Amino acid sequence: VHGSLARVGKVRGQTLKVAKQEKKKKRTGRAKRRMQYNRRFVNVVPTFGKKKGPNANS
Amino acid sequence: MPVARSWVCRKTYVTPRRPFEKSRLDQELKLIGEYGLRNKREVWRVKFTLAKIRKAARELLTLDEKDPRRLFEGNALLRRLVRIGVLDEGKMKLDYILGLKIEDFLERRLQTQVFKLGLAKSIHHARVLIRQRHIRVRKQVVNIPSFIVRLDSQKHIDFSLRSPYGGGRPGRVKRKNAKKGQGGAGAG
Amino acid sequence: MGKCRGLRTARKLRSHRRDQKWHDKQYKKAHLGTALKANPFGGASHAKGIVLEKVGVEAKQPNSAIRKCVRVQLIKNGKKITAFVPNDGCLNFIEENDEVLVAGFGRKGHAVGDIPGVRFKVVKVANVSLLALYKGKKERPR
Amino acid sequence: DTVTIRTRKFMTNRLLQRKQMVIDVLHPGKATVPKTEIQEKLAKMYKTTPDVIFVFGFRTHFGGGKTTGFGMIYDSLDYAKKNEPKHRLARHGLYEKKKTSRKQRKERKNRMKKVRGTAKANVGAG
RNA sequence: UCAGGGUUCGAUUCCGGAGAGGGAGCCUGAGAAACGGCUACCACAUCCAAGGAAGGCAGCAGGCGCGCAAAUUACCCACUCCCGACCCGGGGAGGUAGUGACGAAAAAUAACAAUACAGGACUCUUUCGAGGCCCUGUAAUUGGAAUGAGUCCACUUUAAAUCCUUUAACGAGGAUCCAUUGGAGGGCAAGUCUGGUCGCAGCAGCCGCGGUAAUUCCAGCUCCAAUAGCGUAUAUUAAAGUU
Numbered sequence: 001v002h003g004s005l006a007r008v009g010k011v012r013g014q015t016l017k018v019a020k021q022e023k024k025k026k027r028t029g030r031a032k033r034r035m036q037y038n039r040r041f042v043n044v045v046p047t048f049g050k051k052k053g054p055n056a057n058s
Numbered sequence: 059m060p061v062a063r064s065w066v067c068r069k070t071y072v073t074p075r076r077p078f079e080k081s082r083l084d085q086e087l088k089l090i091g092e093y094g095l096r097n098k099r100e101v102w103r104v105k106f107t108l109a110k111i112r113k114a115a116r117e118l119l120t121l122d123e124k125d126p127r128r129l130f131e132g133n134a135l136l137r138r139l140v141r142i143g144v145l146d147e148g149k150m151k152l153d154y155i156l157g158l159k160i161e162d163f164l165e166r167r168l169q170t171q172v173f174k175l176g177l178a179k180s181i182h183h184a185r186v187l188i189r190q191r192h193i194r195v196r197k198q199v200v201n202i203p204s205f206i207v208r209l210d211s212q213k214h215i216d217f218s219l220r221s222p223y224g225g226g227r228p229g230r231v232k233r234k235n236a237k238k239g240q241g242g243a244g245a246g
Numbered sequence: 247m248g249k250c251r252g253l254r255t256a257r258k259l260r261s262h263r264r265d266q267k268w269h270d271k272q273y274k275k276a277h278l279g280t281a282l283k284a285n286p287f288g289g290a291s292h293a294k295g296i297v298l299e300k301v302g303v304e305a306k307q308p309n310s311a312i313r314k315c316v317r318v319q320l321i322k323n324g325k326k327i328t329a330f331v332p333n334d335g336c337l338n339f340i341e342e343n344d345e346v347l348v349a350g351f352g353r354k355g356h357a358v359g360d361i362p363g364v365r366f367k368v369v370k371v372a373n374v375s376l377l378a379l380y381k382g383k384k385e386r387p388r
Numbered sequence: 389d390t391v392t393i394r395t396r397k398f399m400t401n402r403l404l405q406r407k408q409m410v411i412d413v414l415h416p417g418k419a420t421v422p423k424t425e426i427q428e429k430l431a432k433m434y435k436t437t438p439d440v441i442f443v444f445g446f447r448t449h450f451g452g453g454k455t456t457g458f459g460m461i462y463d464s465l466d467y468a469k470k471n472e473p474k475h476r477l478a479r480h481g482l483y484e485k486k487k488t489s490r491k492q493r494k495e496r497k498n499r500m501k502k503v504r505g506t507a508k509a510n511v512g513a514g
Numbered sequence: 515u516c517a518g519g520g521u522u523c524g525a526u527u528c529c530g531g532a533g534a535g536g537g538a539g540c541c542u543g544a545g546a547a548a549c550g551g552c553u554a555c556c557a558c559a560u561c562c563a564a565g566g567a568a569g570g571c572a573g574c575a576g577g578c579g580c581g582c583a584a585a586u587u588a589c590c591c592a593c594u595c596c597c598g599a600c601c602c603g604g605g606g607a608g609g610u611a612g613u614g615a616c617g618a619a620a621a622a623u624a625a626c627a628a629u630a631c632a633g634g635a636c637u638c639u640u641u642c643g644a645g646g647c648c649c650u651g652u653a654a655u656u657g658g659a660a661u662g663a664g665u666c667c668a669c670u671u672u673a674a675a676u677c678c679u680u681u682a683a684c685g686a687g688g689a690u691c692c693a694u695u696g697g698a699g700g701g702c703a704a705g706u707c708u709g710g711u712c713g714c715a716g717c718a719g720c721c722g723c724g725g726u727a728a729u730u731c732c733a734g735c736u737c738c739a740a741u742a743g744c745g746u747a748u749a750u751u752a753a754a755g756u757u
């Protein structure tokens with residue numbers, strides 16, 4: 001703590017800036033739904049017991 | 059205030075009560091993927107029409123047989139359901155109407171029938187064919203992938219008489235890549 | 247333990263239901279007229295006012311923070327309310343003697359969360375929203 | 389390819405001295421046909437002339453080709469100059485709507501209301 | 515909105531009533547207590563040569579004020595009808611264009627082959643292994659087609675125009691002819707991934723997160739939901755068998 005601990009915008013005013021790394025255009029409309037169908041009903045590799053959440057970092 | 063206008067309109071779908079239900083979610087996505095639909099509103103639409111047909115059928119089914127109104131409206135609903143081919147002519151009674159399914163109406167779409175009848179290489183190819191004016195139902199060019207195809211109309215689907223795929227002048231791509239031989243390698 | 251079932255008792259049933267509806271809390275609150283009078287809004291969804299001065303409401307015991315509310319005076323009534331400025335460093339966008347548009351907090355009459363005595367939030371600072379200033383999509387006009 | 393015309397619900401009208409029918413234009417081809425060409429073909433079909441034949445309202449269907457409108461054949465040019473809504477005569481020169489503007493007619497009338505007797509300032513001097 | 519019963523709303527385009535700043539009194543007329551008529555009082559307010567004169571947009575546009583809150587001082591009697599001495603005149607009634615994410619219907623934003631890898635059915639091989647039919651990813655150069663958004667000729671449309679429809683001539687390689695709004699502890703679909711802050715800043719409808727190893731704060735990456743829409747405040751209905 002250094003000076004007026006009740007100051008506003010403290011944490012958002014000392015966060016390191018990061019530029020967005022983006023490039024590839026995301027698909028839209030029917031094309032996204034077609035991709036989501038493939039990615040879970042026909043692109044599959046099954047196992048007993050294991051957990052397979054779509055964003056699992058573990 | 060007085061004007062010669064009409065204000066009659068309605069909604070054609072209903073959202074589901076439970077918003078995040080894994081089973082409903084994946085069952086509606088299976089149905090979107092296998093019929094190549096754009097939205098889920100396009101599934102809720104068919105669900106709504108099927109629900110209204112079921113409501114009318116069950117409503118007529120509680121009257122006593124020999125009632126003139128039940129006879130008239132049942133013989134009309136059955137005839138109108140066979141006219142699109144979602145019912146066998148050998149069933150034709152209000153008891154079999156409560157046995158239909160959502161994929162009897164999604165089957166009879168035009169996008170489905172264009173692929174299934176063999177004018178396209180996938181349902182995702184069929185949608186862009188219909189939406190690009192390549193398909194003709196008798197003499198009419200139909201732009202709409204939701205055109206519910208009647209029974210007798212099943213024979214007559216083919217390509218538009220002014221379209222590259224059958225008796226048509228080639229499109230703007232086959233006419234600049236050909237001009238490439240004249241204006242892309244002969245004039246520039 | 248007893249209710250009149252008989253065939254000519256429609257008056258008794260109707261009158262008893264009409265008499266007892268006045269013990270339901272929300273029914274009485276909506277049909278009496280005291281809440282529409284005591285409501286700092288005139289029965290409206292939003293309201294414009296002038297900022298008197300910013301304040302530091304300290305949150306309730308199981309939490310610790312200083313919630314940074316403002317003190318507004320409403321144009322149409324002249325009443326003095328306390329409003330909340332929700333975001334990280336959004337209190338810098340609100341000077342003194344500038345008119346702000348506030349709305350409700352989300353419970354229709356009550357304090358939300360750990361904040362005591364506050365029932366509204368600020369949504370517009372001067373014809374420009376606190377969510378366009380928070381993302382840089384806009385900026386204050388001076 | 390070439391244009392074709394065919395006619396539907398034909399009716400001879402002895403009370404307005406004309407013939408009226410629905411006109412279908414078939415044109416597998418390149419644009420909805422000009423009115424001036426349709427009245428030629430009607431003339432050579434019903435064998436009169438292309439100056440008593442009035443056609444209107446043509447609209448063409450989604451996906452091109454068949455196009456539909458309404459046509460009239462007047463038994464003379466005096467009867468044709470008689471009934472004939474004046475805007476339709478002006479489609480080929482037979483009438484000319486000579487005036488300026490509704491607001492001028494309005495504001496003039498309201499100045500003429502404030503004088504009595506010979507209104508020289510507005511029957512002549514505007 | 516609703517299983518059955520009910521609950522809430524109806525200033526608002528059709529029928530009926532009432533009013534023309536507030537009251538009051540009348541003329542003409544078949545029909546008025548008429549206000550696009552008249553006469554007074556009250557409240558406002560305009561010009562004056564100060565003697566006098568003149569007023570009623572809750573009609574169509576427009577303006578000030580009030581507010582959280584609502585459009586052009588446009589064109590035309592061509593349609594629908596009304597009035598008249600009348601087949602001919604007139605109509606801010608009404609029709610037409612403009613502003614318009616109140617709200618309702620249709621449905622663009624990528625389709626298809628090759629190669630490379632991956633999976634599955636299969637063939638033989640003791641087995642490895644290999645080939646081969648379908649699909650899906652994925653990257654690369656491709657590879658060729660297909661088309662409407664946009665510019666735009668003529669017709670068509672209409673009172674005259676616009677828009678749509680019909681049509682020429684141009685018009686795509688994905689880096690732009692670039693989809694958003696909310697969230698990722700539970701309720702409730704989706705990450706114990708990486709940096710920063712350290713009971714502060716902040717989040718959080720509710721339970722609850724933050725005190726130096728934060729699944730919830732600030733960001734980056736990834737993922738989930740609906741999608742040309744999505745979030746928020748309030749009124750109200752079902753859930754409420756908590757009337």
Ligand SMILES: [Mg+2]
Nearest residue numbers: 266268269270
């Ligand atoms: Mg008591």
Ligand SMILES: [Mg+2]
Nearest residue numbers: 270271272275
């Ligand atoms: Mg209480």
Ligand SMILES: [Mg+2]
Nearest residue numbers: 516518519520
């Ligand atoms: Mg009911």
Ligand SMILES: [Mg+2]
Nearest residue numbers: 524525526530
């Ligand atoms: Mg009413």
Ligand SMILES: [Mg+2]
Nearest residue numbers: 524525526572
């Ligand atoms: Mg009122």
Ligand SMILES: [Mg+2]
Nearest residue numbers: 059060525526
């Ligand atoms: Mg109104």
Ligand SMILES: [Mg+2]
Nearest residue numbers: 529530531532
């Ligand atoms: Mg009556």
Ligand SMILES: [Mg+2]
Nearest residue numbers: 534535570572
């Ligand atoms: Mg007034």
Ligand SMILES: [Mg+2]
Nearest residue numbers: 542543544545
């Ligand atoms: Mg009279």
Ligand SMILES: [Mg+2]
Nearest residue numbers: 534547548549
């Ligand atoms: Mg009066």
Ligand SMILES: [Mg+2]
Nearest residue numbers: 534548549550
């Ligand atoms: Mg009147």
Ligand SMILES: [Mg+2]
Nearest residue numbers: 549550551552
């Ligand atoms: Mg007067």
Ligand SMILES: [Mg+2]
Nearest residue numbers: 550570571573
């Ligand atoms: Mg008036």
Ligand SMILES: [Mg+2]
Nearest residue numbers: 571574575576
């Ligand atoms: Mg007005």
Ligand SMILES: [Mg+2]
Nearest residue numbers: 294373580581
């Ligand atoms: Mg204002």
Ligand SMILES: [Mg+2]
Nearest residue numbers: 583584614616
């Ligand atoms: Mg509005």
